[PDB]
Amino acid sequence: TLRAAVFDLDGVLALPAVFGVLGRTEEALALPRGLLNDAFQKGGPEGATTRLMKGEITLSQWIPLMEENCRKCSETAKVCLPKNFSIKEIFDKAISARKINRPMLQAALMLRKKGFTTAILTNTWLDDRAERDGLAQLMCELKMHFDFLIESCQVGMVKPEPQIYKFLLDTLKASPSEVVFLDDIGANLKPARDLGMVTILVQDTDTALKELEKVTGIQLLNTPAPLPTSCNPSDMSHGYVTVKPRVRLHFVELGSGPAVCLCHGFPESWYSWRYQIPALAQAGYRVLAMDMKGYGESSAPPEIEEYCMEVLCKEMVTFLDKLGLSQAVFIGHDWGGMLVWYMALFYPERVRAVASLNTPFIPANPNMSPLESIKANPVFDYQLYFQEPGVAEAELEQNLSRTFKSLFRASDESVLSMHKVCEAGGLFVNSPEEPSLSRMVTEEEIQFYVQQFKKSGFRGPLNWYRNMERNWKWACKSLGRKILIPALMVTAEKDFVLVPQMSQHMEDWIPHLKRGHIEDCGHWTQMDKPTEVNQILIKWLDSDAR
């Protein structure tokens, strides 16, 4: 049986192939056929290209040696090289033009999902070009999805030498017949074939993958639309900032650039944004997925007053102040969405841009007590149940697995009531003791929220709802203000509490507000429809927050 797949970079994982750019430059400049490809391989294992692929010299060092061999080949062919000929400009263009072959990356990912061991085996160089960042950005994005990455310039060997094949085989800890090897170079497959490994000459992606599925007996073509890339909590950078002596806040960091502070709801985690952290970092953002106060690894003080909007927003400001951030894009959901709107109302200097998932901005009524406002709407009866201290904690802290399995469900799958939650005596009263697993989450994803909620419980989480009177008095100070900073409101079609219509009037308060909308999407926006969340957020970030 097969248990390992090997991918070549150029021509297989990334397109177009750099070999083809030599053949393209000969046609553009009308130089004789194969002149550039022959000057590239001059010497064979003794040439400048092999010293480059083996890693003896840098690509900056290599440039003038190729140039010399280009001059040499043109002299022999009895032809002339043009005036503005620059090897650097040709390679700069070819590298920058080269992008990931997405169907190939998805085939790798599908193979690795079925337990296969995956690796990139490439003849590469040590790029010290002033424009090296581009090739580096590319490599990181591919590498992350494979078990190994074998770069010829770091090991000191090259394809087609037999040694690298015995090195990779040793790294894979597998035998030849257990390995599928994909290369666009016919001669680079011959050693792998002579060893007994299954070989695929990659001309077109579709035929290559058709051979790759017939041989694996695993479907790789015509597959359903894949989920965005998620997080393994063990592989993240974990951050901790002390905002006040008794309170510390925890976050997860990924990417470089404009700071994007992610704020989860109830009863959630930094992990709720798991399908958004890799995508948003890939889009050129510094993602900071918070564990809001009362959750995971952030401090959970017992007092109710520690969770009023004024205290929590001062702490988000202190967090910035201590991290050295003058600004942050603030993207919230559910309770974080509320925090995020009040971050914009009270601290616009510190907020670059503001986005909210499901949660709308709705001003305070200086003529109505907030308690009356909750009773007035039947869907908000669960908030009245969360009022008495200890009541919902006892129910939610009873069987954590059951709690998250009963809550984290898609619109149709809903096992919850939410019409006289107070009367019925709880949220899970008519929910099973052993609920089925939702299609939105895995067993492992459920098991992560369980571990997290074992530290502090639901007192802190529920205390965010226990400050309605405090929140109202503070908000009334902002009644004559308008949100005049970039803003994105995202409504979810099947969210039965945070209904799309509840946002209808927001323009009176945020005139330049951008909108988003996800169909057949319930309350758990981020995991229900991650792809759509990603497409909407990246679009608004590039247009409204550079």
Ligand X SMILES: O=C([O-])c1cc(C2CCCCC2)ccc1O
Q: Which does 382 bind (CB under 5 to 8 A by kind): a second copy, ligand X, none?
A: ligand X
List 36, 200, 309, 527, residue binding a second copy (CB under 8 A): 200
389-397: Cβ within 8 A, 24+ apart:
389/304, 389/459, 389/466, 392/426, 392/427, 392/458, 392/462, 393/457, 393/458, 393/459, 393/462, 395/426, 395/427, 395/428, 396/267, 396/427, 396/458, 396/462, 397/453, 397/457, 397/458
Q: Is 175 in the site for a second copy (CB under 8 A)?
A: no
User: Minimum Å distance from CB 495 to ligand X?
Assistant: 5
Dump the DSSP string for 482-535.
---S-EEEEEETT-SSS-GGGGTTGGGT-TT-EEEEETT--S-HHHHSHHHHHH
- The yes-or-no answer on residue 333 being catalytic is no
Query: Using an 8 Å Cβ cutoff, are 197 and 164 in contact?
Result: no
The annotation status of 184 as a binding-site residue, yes or no, is yes
Smallest separation, CB 414 to ligand X (Å): 4
User: How many residues would you count in the chain?
Assistant: 546
Least distance to a second copy from the beta carbon of 186, Å? 6
User: Cα(10)–Cα(142) distance, rounded to whole angstroms?
Assistant: 12
Catalytic annotation on 250?
no
From the list 123-131, 191-199, 228-236, 486-494, the region that binds a second copy by CB under 8 A is: 191-199
DSSP-H helix ranges across 295-360: 309-323, 335-346
Please tell me whether residue 333 binds ligand X under the rule CB under 6 A: no
Chain residues 491-520 in contact with ligand X, contact rule CB under 6 A: 495-497
**Is 385 part of any known ligand binding site?**
no
In the bound state with ligand X, the residue whose beta carbon lies nearer, of 327 and 399, is: 399
Which amino acid is residue 521, in one-letter code?
C
Cα-based angle 327, 329, 332 (whole degrees, multiple of 5): 130
Q: Minimum CB separation from ligand X for residue 365, in Å?
A: 23
Q: In whole angstroms, how close is the CB of 68 to a second copy at the nearest point?
A: 16
Contact 168, 121 (CB under 8 A): yes
Binding segment toward ligand X, per CB under 6 A, in 80-88, 296-304, 453-461, 489-497:
489-497
- Residue 147 annotated in active site: no
190 binds a second copy (CB under 8 A): yes
The verdict on 214 binding a second copy (CB under 8 A) reads: yes
Rounded to an integer, what distance in angstroms lies between the CA atom of residue 141 and that of residue 164?
24
Q: Site residues (CB under 6 A) for ligand X?
A: 266, 382, 409, 411, 414, 416, 495-497, 522-523
Under the rule (CB under 8 A), what is the footprint of a second copy?
32-34, 37-38, 73, 76-79, 186, 189-190, 193, 196, 198-203, 207-208, 211, 214-215
Binding residues for phosphate: 122-123
Active site residues per annotation:
334, 465, 523
